[PDB]
Design a binder for this molecule. Sequence first.
Ligand code: CU
Ligand code: CU
Length: 330
Amino acid sequence: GLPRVAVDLVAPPLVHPHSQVAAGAPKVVQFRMSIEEKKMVADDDGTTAQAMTFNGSVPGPTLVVHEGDYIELTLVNPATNSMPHNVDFHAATGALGGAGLTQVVPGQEAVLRFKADRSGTFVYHCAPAGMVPWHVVSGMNGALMVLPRDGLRDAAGAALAYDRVYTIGESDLYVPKAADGNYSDYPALASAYADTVAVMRTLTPSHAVFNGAVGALTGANALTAAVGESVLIIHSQANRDSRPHLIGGHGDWVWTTGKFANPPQLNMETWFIPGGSAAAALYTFKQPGTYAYLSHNLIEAMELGAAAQASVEGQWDDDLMTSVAAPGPA
Ligand SMILES: [Cu+2]
Ligand SMILES: [Cu+2]
C-alpha cells in the first residue's frame, strides 16, 4: 527546524480537535496511520466487502492542519495484511503526492513529510501501481483539511466559524453477484479481486455507501446538532461523483470544489462533488427535527445507500414554517 507537534486521530464522522484560526506558527504536525484490510458487512442482508481501510475505517480519518504547516505521516502496513500500500495526498506536490515514497509491503512502515501550502479539503488515497482503482474502491481513502491560518471566511472577507465538523465519506462499491444473483462471499481478499474488476468495468455500483455501511449514519449513529449551531459537513468521494443535499436545509456557504481560497457561494440547494475530490459546506440549523443528508440522485440515495441523518434538538420557529391546515377533510 520548526516545532513538531503530534496530533491524535479520531474516527469518522468525528474530526480530531483543532483551532480554526490559529495565532500559532507553521509547525510540523505528526500523524500515524495503520493500513487494515478487513472483511465487512456492507448492508443489512449480510452482503460483505473484502475492504481495505486506513485506520480500520471506510473512510480513513481526516487529518486537519493549517496552511503553512508540514505533514508528517508515518504509514504502517502491519505484517498481517497482505497487499502492499501507499498514500497519494491530493494536497501534496511531487512524486504522485507521495505515492512514490510510501510503498509499504506487508510488515513495513514509512514516513513522509510534505508542506501543506495550499488550503482546503483534499482527498488522500492508496494508489499501488496497477491496483489504484481496486484499492481506492475498496475503502482506501480519506480527507485532509488545510484550514487557512486566519480561519474560514465568506465571499467578502468576513470571518466564518463552525461549532462542529463531521466527515461523511461516500464510497461507491462494486460487489459481484453469483450465477443465482446472490452476491458472492469471498474469504481471502485476493479471491475477490478477480470478479470485482469485471464489475468495475460496468461502471455501475452495486451499493453506494456513506462511512462504510447502509444505515451507517442513522439511528443511534445519526449525526447531532442543536438549533442555532453552525456545522461543517465535509464530504469526500475519491472515485465517483455525488451531489449532496440536506433535506429541509440548505448549504449556507459551499466550497463545492473544496479549496478555501475561493469564494464560498450562497444558498446552495444541492451542491456537487467531482469524483476524486472533497468539498465542504457550512450550514446553521434553524428548525429542530431529523434531517437527511444524501446524494440527490434519489436512486443512488434511497435505493443504493447514499443518505444519512442528522438529529437537531431545539425550538421550532413557526415563522419559517407552519401547518396552516393539517391534512385531512373533516
Ligand atoms: Cu492499498
Ligand atoms: Cu487521486
